[PDB]
Copies of this chain bind each other. A is one copy, B any other.
């Protein structure tokens, strides 16, 4: 192919509690990244047989 992928992710947070209480929960986010290839770089040279012989 002509692409590649890499993932990303977030962090968490701390909280506090006392007896008789229930714990709370939070979500976590994510995203992505992509790169592509688009161009060829070159260099060329030509010569003739008669010139090469002399």
Residues of A within 8 A of B (CB): 12-18, 23-26, 28, 38-46
| Count of chain copies | 2
Selected from B14, B18, B43, the residue in CB contact (under 8 A) with A38 is B18
Q: How far in angstroms is the closest Cβ of chain B from A54?
A: 15
Which secondary structure dominates where chain A touches chain B? loop
The answer to whether B40 and A14 touch across the interface, beta carbons within 8 angstroms, is: no
Additional pairs, 4, CB under 8 Å, beyond known A16-B42, A18-B40, A25-B45: A12-B43, A14-B42, A18-B38, A23-B42
Check B44–A25 contact: CB distance below 8 A: yes
The answer to whether B18 and A41 touch across the interface, beta carbons within 8 angstroms, is: no
Instruction: Determine the chain B residues whose CB is within 8 A of the CB of A41 once the complex forms.
Output: 14-17
